[PDB]
């Protein structure tokens, strides 16, 4: 692993989930049973590290 | 079902589940409301 950086366009391997983008702080509410998120049509919209 | 029947008569409901399709609604907090 490495260290994570926010609000800069990076590439990320979150537990085998490979994607690209800008990470920032989310006002959404994950319940503890949740593992990750998606919003519409299998695009991971939020992730808890 | 297992009871802690004290040495001295309890109510519950059981239904059987069936395969079919559903439409579920989520609110803001990621939970089910309808």
Q: Is A29 on the interface with B (CB under 8 A)?
A: yes
d(CA A5, CA A11): 10
d(CA B26, CA B34): 8
**Among B25, B33, B30, residue whose Cα is nearest residue A26:** B30
CA distance A18 to chain B (A): 24
Token representation of residue B29: 């907090």
What resolution does the deposited structure have, in angstroms? 3.6
Strand, helix or coil at A6?
coil
Residue B20 CB-half CA count within 13 A: 6
The burial class, CB within 10 Å (0-12 / 13-18 / 19+), for A3 is exposed
Task: Report CA-CA distances (Å) from B23 to A1, A38, B15, B19, B30.
Answer: 40, 18, 20, 14, 15
Token representation of residue B10: 């309890």
Q: Chains A and B: how many Cβ contacts under 8 Å?
A: 9
């Amino acid at each position: 692993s490495t260290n994570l950086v926010k609000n800069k366009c990076v590439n990320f391997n979150f537990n085998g989930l490979t994607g690209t983008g800008v990470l920032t702080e989310s006002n959404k509410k994950f319940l503890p049973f949740q593992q990750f998120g998606r919003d519409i049509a299998d695009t991971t919209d939020a992730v808890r590290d | 079902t297992l009871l802690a029947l004290h040495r001295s008569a309890a109510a519950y409901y059981v239904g059987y589940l069936q395969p079919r399709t559903f439409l579920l609604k989520y609110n803001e907090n990621g939970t089910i409301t309808d």
